[PDB]
Amino acid sequence: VLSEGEWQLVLHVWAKVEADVAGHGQDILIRLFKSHPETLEKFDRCKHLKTEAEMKASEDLKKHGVTVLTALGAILKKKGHHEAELKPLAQSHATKHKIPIKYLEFISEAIIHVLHSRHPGDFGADAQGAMNKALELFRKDIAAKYKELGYQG
Ligand code: HEM
Ligand SMILES: O=C1C=CC(=O)N1c1ccc(O)cc1
């Protein structure tokens, strides 16, 4: 469980992300695809992205990144009470997109990299620790739901 202070650090930095959801979403997905290129194979329209500049110019990539950050933001604002928000995400990610927990670890690392790149002054050790605990709780709860739906990935 997170402390109230740890939640407040997570939501403080999240309010910075919300100043430019699209740009943060682009940088997070570009970092994910650069660091772990196998992840580009999870959506057919993304095999066409061969350069960083094409990734930055893709309206499709930018809209995907806003959808990710919008859903994750709503989950983090529930401060752990996120069953109703997490269930549908687990359903689609386990049964349709087939995203393994290791790929949710990859995108978590990219989220931490971008938040520290853009907001170092508001993302020091305590804030990084709080965000890492919040993303750990997200991945733990989503994996339990994956298993309830019969997906062991
Ligand atoms: C913080 C983690 C993530 C969140 C909150 C998130 C959220 C979402 C949401 C809200 C959608 C649209 C609704 C849906 O189908 O569920 C979506 C679709 C999708 N996600 Fe994720 N996602 C996450 C991580 C990933 C990762 C790591 C991958 C691939 C490696 C991925 C692949 C997909 C695909 C292929 C779709 C459908 C895209 C489309 O049809 O245009 N997701 N995700
Ligand atoms: O799977 C792929 C390949 C490239 C791309 O943009 N995505 C994607 C990632 C996360 C997401 O939520 C939606 C789509």
DSSP for 37-105, please give it.
GGGGGGSGGGTT--SHHHHHH-HHHHHHHHHHHHHHHHHHHTTT--HHHHHHHHHHIIIII---HHHHH
According to the entry, how was the structure determined? X-ray
C-alpha span between 74 and 86 (Å, rounded): 10
Domain ranges of the chain: 4-148
Distances (CA, A) of 147 to 31, 72, 95, 99: 28, 20, 11, 13
Looking at domain 4-148, which CATH architecture does it have?
A: Orthogonal Bundle (1.10)
- Measure the CA dihedral 26/93/48/50, to 10°: 50
CB burial class (10 A; 0-12, 13-18, 19+) of residue 77? middle
Resolution in A: 1.5
Least distant ligand from the CA of 47: 2
- The alpha carbon of 3 and the centre of ligand 2 are apart by a number of angstroms equal to 32
**Which of 29, 43, 68, 106 maximizes ligand 1 atoms within 8 Å of its Cβ, making it the mutation to test the pocket?**
68
Distance separating alpha carbons of residues 25 and 17, to the nearest angstrom: 9
Name the residue at shortest CA distance from atom 12 of ligand 2. 68
CA distance 93 to 101: 10
